[PDB]
């Protein structure tokens, strides 16, 4: 609530300054403050929110992977302790993002594109939690990620054409979830393949072609790695 006294428009302005200064923790805090004003985000603002937190969590994920690798090879307590410290901070960031999506971005989203964007983001942040979770907590997190992704899938099939870039990126990330997290390579391949084929059928109706084809190649790269 440290941003509660600042105007929404000032928070958005400062988020953009923070991005220019490569101060992504600041950028995320400003965007969190803007979300907590309770108003819907524009497309540009949703992208600011996502970029800010991805930079923060991405740095934490990379550090966690470095430390986990040192830990695996070492097998004193220090490596584990420091890995756990980074892990707890990453979990805190994901919990923060998930809290913004549940209170109340998803339910307030005014169009299908924004709703899918946020439900995909919910799946993504549960997926980031799943990478570091263990045991029964991991199983609950995995089910939560799947449920968010599947709700986004249902909406995008009813409301978006199969070439829509947001729909394509959702399918990309959900397929990564199946393969990397849920140990379901056949679901990952089936989803990526179906998505690829259904978008390919409509490429000729597009101006957009660049956008959709870019994400189709991301699906293809994963299929090649997977098959």
């Amino acid at each position: 609530g440290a941003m509660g006294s600042m105007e929404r428009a000032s928070l958005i302005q400062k988020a953009k300054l923070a991005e220019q200064a490569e101060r992504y923790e600041d950028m995320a805090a400003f965007m969190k403050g803007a979300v907590e004003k309770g108003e819907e985000l524009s497309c540009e603002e949703r992208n600011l929110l996502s970029v800010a937190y991805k930079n923060v969590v991405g740095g934490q994920r990379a550090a966690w992977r470095v430390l986990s690798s040192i830990e695996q090879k070492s097998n004193g307590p220090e490596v584990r302790e420091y890995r756990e410290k980074v892990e707890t901070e990453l979990q805190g960031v994901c919990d923060t993002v998930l809290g913004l999506l549940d209170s109340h971005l998803i339910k307030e989203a005014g169009d299908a594109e924004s709703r899918v964007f946020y439900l995909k983001m919910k799946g993504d942040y549960y997926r980031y939690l799943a990478e570091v979770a263990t045991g029964d907590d991991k199983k609950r997190i995995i089910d939560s990620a799947r449920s968010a992704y599947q709700e986004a899938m249902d909406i995008s099939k009813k409301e978006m054409p199969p070439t829509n870039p947001i729909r394509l990126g959702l399918a990309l990330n959900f397929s990564v979830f199946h393969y990397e997290i849920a140990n379901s390579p056949e679901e990952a391949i089936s989803l990526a393949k179906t998505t690829f084929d259904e978008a390919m059928a409509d490429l000729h109706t597009l101006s957009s072609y660049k956008d959709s084809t870019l994400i189709m190649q991301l699906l293809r790269d994963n299929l090649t790695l997977w098959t």
Partner: peptide
């Protein structure tokens, strides 16, 4: 496996 890069 890489996810959406943005």
């Amino acid at each position: 496996t890489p996810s959406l890069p943005g």
